Amino acid sequence: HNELIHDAVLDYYGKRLATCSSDKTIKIFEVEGETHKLIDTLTGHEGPVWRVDWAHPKFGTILASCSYDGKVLIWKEENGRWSQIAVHAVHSASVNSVQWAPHEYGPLLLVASSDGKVSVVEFKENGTTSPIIIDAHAIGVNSASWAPATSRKFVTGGADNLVKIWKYNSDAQTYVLESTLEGHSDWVRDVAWSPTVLLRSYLASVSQDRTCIIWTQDNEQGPWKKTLLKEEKFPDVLWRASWSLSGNVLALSGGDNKVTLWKENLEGKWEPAG
Amino acid sequence: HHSQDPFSECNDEIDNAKLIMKERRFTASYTFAKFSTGSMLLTKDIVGKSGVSIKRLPTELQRKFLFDDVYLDKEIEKVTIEARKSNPYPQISESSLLFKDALDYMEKTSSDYNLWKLSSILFDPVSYPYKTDNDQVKMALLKKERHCRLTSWIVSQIGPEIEEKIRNSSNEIEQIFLYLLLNDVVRASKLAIESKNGHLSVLISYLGSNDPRIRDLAELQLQKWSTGGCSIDKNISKIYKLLSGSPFEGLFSLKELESEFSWLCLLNLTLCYGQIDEYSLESLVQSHLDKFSLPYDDPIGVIFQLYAANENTEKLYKEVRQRTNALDVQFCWYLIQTLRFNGTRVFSKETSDEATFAFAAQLEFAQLHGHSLFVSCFLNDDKAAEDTIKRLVMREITLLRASTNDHILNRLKIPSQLIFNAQALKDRYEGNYL
Amino acid sequence: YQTERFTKFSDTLKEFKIEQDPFNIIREFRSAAGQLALDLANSGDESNVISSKDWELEARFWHLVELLLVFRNADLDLDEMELHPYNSRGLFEKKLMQDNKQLYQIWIVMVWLKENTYVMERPKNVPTSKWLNSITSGGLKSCDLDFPLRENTNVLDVKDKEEDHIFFKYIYELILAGAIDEALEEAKLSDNISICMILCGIQEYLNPVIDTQIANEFNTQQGIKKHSLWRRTVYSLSQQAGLDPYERAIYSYLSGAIPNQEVLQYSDWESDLHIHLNQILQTEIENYLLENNQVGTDELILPLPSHALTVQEVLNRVASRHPSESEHPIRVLMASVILDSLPSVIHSSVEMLLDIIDKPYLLRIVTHLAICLDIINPGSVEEVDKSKLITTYISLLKLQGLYENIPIYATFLNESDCL
């Protein structure tokens, strides 16, 4: 049985898969070709597990998951057996996303719950948590992705149809909101920053209103540029929006049964590939 | 009367569920998918054993020999890697790659072979073994050579087309013309001799000797004719037009033949008679091109234009790019690379990298990390080269360590640091350190 | 006042031994007899017409003599030519001509032969355009030269054929005379552009850029590459009857072949000798090119005689073909000079003095020639024969009453002390 897994994730070396469904269990597998042997099952959530996500192997084998029970549970494999090592749910509602940061930031994490909040839970020397939260979206937050950099930043998809870009600041100690963008007519489902350290910066924000806006910012100055992928609605609301590493390609998990794939051409506009 | 039931547990979840969805907006038409570390996708697949599918992102890269490690080894023997002057990361210093090379790995029949072949004929440097008294003469001899190769090749292609047409010609003089279309002066001359067209036969022998005297004489005869000449055979005039040296470029023009022969068949005419000596292969080919537009989507056509555009090859390259896809990602990279490493032409640090990325990627997507690493080096941007190499070296250190063809690999010039560094992290993740 | 003559000849002689180069005696010798051939010619008894031509012939004789000796003797071994396989046919021909003095001489002789060839006067009243009558009678479905070839000659109006005749014959006399430029000019201007082009094929390919050693003479490539082909093509064309005999004759010459009977029937010793030497040449060059892999097989369309006669054998055959003219006294000297066996004949005619004394000029000529020979080539004639000649000549300066200048001639011998 498994009629509905809400999220799955791949480890840096893609050898261990971590799928999490509604029955509140997170199933760990040992992937290989056509055989992904079940190696674990992890129960400890009081609601459907929305998303799972490993951390850079530079921190052992850590997997921070967010479930419906308003709580985010950090896990960890220890000598062959997992163990909920810590927890952080200073959020008054269902936790939606949870995405670690680039390992050059330490072991930071990023949670986005319905209480219009998003925290940056770092792990101190004792392994203990030191949260520095910030209110992000009034009517709730559906997602929030990090940004690879070399002055840190992350994007946040909300319920009030916004897409914010926060930036860490020493003078504030808590990420200072610098830019927000509008262009959707329904809960900005998922938002994503791209791992392309090329000329500019790309961000594909999928939504409920069945559109995908691409925020391409020339550089550290000229504000973003709105560009509805295609100018027609997809036959059903869209959910996920993930970038590829090598290739700046975009995959869209539209709530219509297949994932489209859009690439950028010399026209600056995007075209389907696949 | 409304009743009370104590087994209302199977109806508590059902309604407690529908409650969760709608407050979330989670519509029964849910699908998730994000790009893999090892660039590929996983999407909710309710028919496997995990609810996800290990999707092998389809490869845009379609060219057999690339999935062979033999090719890549031999292709590295041709490079000379030097560490950057702004970081210890590799980056090609010398390349001896030539379109010529890749020919052994293709069918001498595939249209692909034709692209690579012609691209060689026109770009790969030609060598002249016999020493020349003077070096300006060498230049001259090298041109006849290349012109001779190019002209002989075009005849291979138009071959059947023309032979077919000769099969049906019901007129002698018309065939005499057709043979000239195949660049066979002697057979034309012979047929002429045999068909009682003796005078014509002598004139034909001139075809190939850019003799300007004969050139102007022919035009003169043509003029005197189209200024009265109550009647002159439709083909005899075509043959004279050819002796004139500018068969389209004129007033009795063979341009109308544009709809009877291959655009290539006609280009041959210009290249064979057109005034070989006074022009360069480039400006001459350009000359022909300026008279006829070619099919936007034709590749062997795109090459000729790139070859002819000599002065602004890049400008055109970009233009070509934003208009057709005849030139694949691999080719475009290989092309820019040879021309760069051979002085043949010039390209932007950026256009040369843009082309490299594109291939470095299409290659990673095919799981060919070794090969995709190699390519990565040709990057001019040290910053990007570094990042790109590193990122991939670690994220894959495993596979890049089995065979010696995998050895020569990290042996490219991958930094000592970066190799063991990634290697370390392959251990604190696997649990067996030092 | 003509009986002066011996004046001119001896006259030179003085100015020579009076300036103390030798090639000027002959040069003047020529000019002299030339001036005489004019007098006796201009106005006079129809008996002078005969003694006239014998002076012209004399003139030609000295000319030929000057030409050949200048080259043979004046010769001061210039530099050699180093070619490469990438060089043009044109350079090879040039080289062949520098290196092979034997052959070059043939050229020298042909240049001479042309120099003295007769050419008619430019045809007057030539038609505005070609084959007008046929065009006007309506019947020329096509106006190219190959049209009446392609189907029965009944096509061309008689009047037209009549004019092609005048043209072709004239172009022919022009080619025989060496007037290739007048030839091209006529072709152009008389509306025979096609025939004109054929005349251009005469040159082998040269390209300033590659064939460097002549980047001086030209700035633009010229000449035609597939020459062997051209040659056969022309040759074959020459053989196709249905063409005017003179047109066929032209291609014959151009191919290095011998013109047809109808035309060749009217050629004389010079004409005939000219034709055949042309052939030795044509053949010689092509073989030199075959010997150097400079002829591509594709071009060997037809067979052309590959064996070259020798000047000796040519003269021999041309001889028996024109006995009368062959035999004439001074023409025999022309041949002697050509073959070099000159002293061989001086000594010969000298013994014809021990029917030479019947013909006036001979006794004089042989003498002055012998004089000239030993001046230019000390050792040439046997001291015996000089004497024997001057002797018998000096004795005729007496019978003539001109002891006045016998001293000049005495300058050669110690036997002068007997005068």
UniProtKB/Swiss-Prot annotation, chain A:
It is found in: Cytoplasmic vesicle, COPII-coated vesicle membrane; Endoplasmic reticulum membrane; Nucleus, Nuclear pore complex; Vacuole membrane. The keyword Chaperone does not apply. GO terms for biological process: COPII-coated vesicle budding; ERAD pathway; mRNA transport; nuclear pore localization; nucleocytoplasmic transport; positive regulation of DNA-templated transcription; positive regulation of ER to Golgi vesicle-mediated transport; positive regulation of protein exit from endoplasmic reticulum. Its main location: membrane. GO terms for cellular component: cell periphery; COPII vesicle coat; endoplasmic reticulum; endoplasmic reticulum membrane; nuclear envelope; nuclear pore; nuclear pore outer ring; Seh1-associated complex. SMART domains: WD40. GO terms for molecular function: structural molecule activity. WD repeats lie at residues 1-39, 44-85, 90-131, 136-176, 183-225, 233-272. The keyword Hydrolase does not apply. Keywords: Cytoplasmic vesicle, Endoplasmic reticulum, ER-Golgi transport, Membrane, mRNA transport, Nuclear pore complex, Nucleus, Protein transport, Repeat, Translocation, Transport, Vacuole, WD repeat. It is a peripheral membrane protein. It holds the Pfam family WD40. Present with 21400 molecules/cell in log phase SD medium. Functions as a component of the nuclear pore complex (NPC) and the COPII coat. It is one of 5 proteins constituting the COPII coat, which is involved in anterograde (ER to Golgi) double-membrane transport vesicle formation. First the small GTPase SAR1, activated by and binding to the integral ER membrane protein SEC12, exchanges GDP for GTP and recruits the heterodimer SEC23/24, which in turn recruits the heterotetramer SEC13-SEC31. The polymerization of COPII coat complexes then causes physically the deformation (budding) of the membrane, leading to the creation of a transport vesicle. Belongs to the WD repeat SEC13 family. This is Protein transport protein SEC13.
Curated annotation (Swiss-Prot), chain B:
It is a peripheral membrane protein. It comes from Saccharomyces cerevisiae (strain ATCC 204508 / S288c) (Baker's yeast). This is Nucleoporin NUP145C. Transmembrane segments: none annotated. It comes from the Eukaryota. It is found in: Nucleus, Nuclear pore complex; Nucleus membrane. The modification Phosphothreonine is found at residue 27. The chain holds residues 731 to 1158 of 1317 of the full protein.
UniProtKB/Swiss-Prot annotation, chain C:
It is a peripheral membrane protein. Its main location: nucleus. Keywords: Coiled coil, Membrane, mRNA transport, Nuclear pore complex, Nucleus, Protein transport, Translocation, Transport. The keyword Transcription does not apply. Component of the nuclear pore complex (NPC). NPC constitutes the exclusive means of nucleocytoplasmic transport. NPCs allow the passive diffusion of ions and small molecules and the active, nuclear transport receptor-mediated bidirectional transport of macromolecules such as proteins, RNAs, ribonucleoparticles (RNPs), and ribosomal subunits across the nuclear envelope. Due to its 8-fold rotational symmetry, all subunits are present with 8 copies or multiples thereof. Present with 8580 molecules/cell in log phase SD medium. This is Nucleoporin NUP84. The chain holds residues 7 to 442 of 726 of the full protein.
